[model samples]
Target: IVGGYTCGANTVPYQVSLNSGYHFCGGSLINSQWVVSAAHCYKSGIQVRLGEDNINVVEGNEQFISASKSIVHPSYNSNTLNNDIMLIKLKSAASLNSRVASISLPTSCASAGTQCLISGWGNTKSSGTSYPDVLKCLKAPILSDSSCKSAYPGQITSNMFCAGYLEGGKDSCQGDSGGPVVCSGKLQGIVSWGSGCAQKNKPGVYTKVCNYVSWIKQTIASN
Candidate 1:
């Protein structure tokens, strides 16, 4: 995350790192066996690391589990980035503890102006490979659909929403995609895309989690 602070060891219990050989994307632990992430981050041979605070160090709190399967949303559009969400099933169920846990899904939609928290191991710059060793986090407020649409005309859709400052300086960047966007202690969004890292009039767009609640439930149940 750009312009963010290092997170504490147990600050974000539900956060997980999606990795093959290295951290590529962030995800949320929705249950002991299921994780939610951006569909764009999907790749074969992914391993999920839970209870992670720093990626560079071997912390005893971490649990590394291989992904058994990945289910990307059926309507995920690469061109427009619509419904850009995915579900990852763990090969084995995670053993939850104080340092590792799951987050609840949102029962309702978040309105504009709802304050939220976003955390990731993404880049610290708008353009560069300066990813932090430790996880970073920042607060962002939900922006109205009209405002988000204005920022990226013809690109915004009902399955997407924007967050962060209009003037910029703070936002989620590359490697942060598929991360959690929590609002009111619930999973509200999944980091999907943006114009750049953090630019003026360009807030980070996220997959609206509320809009896919039924899909998430049914997917998990059937598969």
Candidate 2:
């Protein structure tokens, strides 16, 4: 994340790295056998690295598991970027430890001004091409739907919300897409899209997790 600080080991246990020989996107472990990420990152043969802190090092605390299956939201729109959430079932259940655990889904929708934490291994600058080996985190606040709509006209949907500083700086960037946006220790959003990394009035858009709780549960139960 841009303008963020390095996260301590196990600071965010639910964090997971979607890798294919390297980290490309971030995800959250929602259950022993399920992961939540952005639908845009969907592909076959992805490895979910749980308990991951540093992508450059083999911490030994990390668990590498294959994605048995991935189900993208049926209503997901590639052009509009709506319903940008995806669920993945692990080939095998993960064994939770101090550095590996599942996160609770949102109990309620996050309103504007709700403080949240976003963590990932995305670019540290808005105009750069670098990804951190260590996970970074930023404290961003949820923006109102109206505010989000104003930032990106004709783009904001009910399924999508925003979180970041309106004045610019501090946001999740490329490679961070599909990461968790946690608030009050619950998974509130999934990093999806934005105008820029952290441009003024252009907050990072996210898939409103609360709106997809039913879909998530039903998909898992049926799959």
Candidate 3:
């Protein structure tokens, strides 16, 4: 995330690196066997790396889990980024420990101006060149829904929320897709998409998790 400090190994236990061959996107462990991320991050041969903060090396707590199934929202629109969310069922349940744990899912909608946290290894700038070896975290305030809707009028739906600073700093850019937006210690949003790394009045838009909470529960139970 742009304008953020490096998050230590213990900062976000549920944060995971979603990869094909290497870290390309971020994700959150919602349960022992389920991971939540953005649908746009879905691709062939996707894998989830858990209990890891440094993306460069293999740590003792690191647990690499293969995804047996990726359930992307059927109505996820690539152009408008509507319902941009997904769930990855791990081949086996993640072994819970100090560095590896599950994050809570929001039971109700999040409030605007609520303080939240976002973490990722995405590019640091709008140019979108290199990714950091260590994960990063930044605090972002939940933007007002009306104000957020005004920015991208007629495009954003109920399945999306806004977070970031309005002064053009601190946001999740490219490659950060699928990361968690932790609010009140619950998974409230998913790093869906944004205009740039950090831009004025263009805070990063995220997939609102509350709107699809029922869908998520149904998908998990059926699958």
Candidate 4:
């Protein structure tokens, strides 16, 4: 996450790294066998790294789980980034422990102006080419749909939500796609996209996870 600091190991076990080829995308473990990420972040050569803290080293708690399937939302619209969410089914179930766990799905949608936390191994700046070696986290306040509307004007939708600062300098940046936005200790949104990473009045956009709870459950059950 941009404008953030490195987090402690296993502080957020649900966080995962999706290494698709040379690039990496962040994700959240929703269950022992399923991970939730952004559909737009999909690509080939995907694998989920669980219990990972430092990307530069594979700590003992880390486990690389093979992704057996990547199911992107059928209604996901790349053009507008609507419903930009996806699920990754692990080839085998994760060995759950204190260092590896799934995050709780939200029972209700997040209200506007709620403070939240976002974590990932993404770029520190919009122009930065370097992705952080360690996981980073930042606190962002969710803006109202009306406030989010004015920021992007005609671009914001119900399927997506906004969280960041109006003055800029704090948000999820590149490589943070599919990361988690936790509010009240529940997964509220999935990091999807942004204008240019922490730009003034351009908070990060995310897939409203709560809005798609039924879909997530149905998809998991069907699979």
Against the unseen true structure, what C-alpha lDDT does each candidate score? 0.94, 0.92, 0.89, 0.89
Tens digits of lDDT, candidate 1, 11-42: 99999999999999999999999999999999
Candidate 1: residue 82 lDDT (0-100)? 91
Model 1, TM vs. native: 0.98
**Residues 1-223, model 3: lDDT tens digits:** 8898899986799999997988889899999999999999988788899988788888678899899999999898988989999999999999999899999888988899998999999988755566788888999999998988887778778888999988887889887899999999999999998777788878899999988888889999998
In candidate 1, the residue pairs with backbone N, CA or C atoms under 3 Å apart (3 or more residues apart, or in different chains) clash, namely 38-178
* Lowest lDDT block of 10, candidate 3: 123-132
Cα lDDT tens digits for candidate 4, 44-98: 6688999888888867898888899999998999999999999999999999899
> How many clashes in candidate 3?
0
Task: Give TM per candidate.
Answer: 0.98, 0.98, 0.96, 0.97
The candidate, 1 or 3, that scores higher on lDDT is 1
Report how far residue 24 has shifted in candidate 4, in Å. Answer: 1.6
Candidate structures ordered by lDDT, highest first? 1, 2, 3, 4
**Candidate 4 collision pairs:** none
Best by lDDT: 1
Per-residue error (Å), model 4, residue 52: 0.5
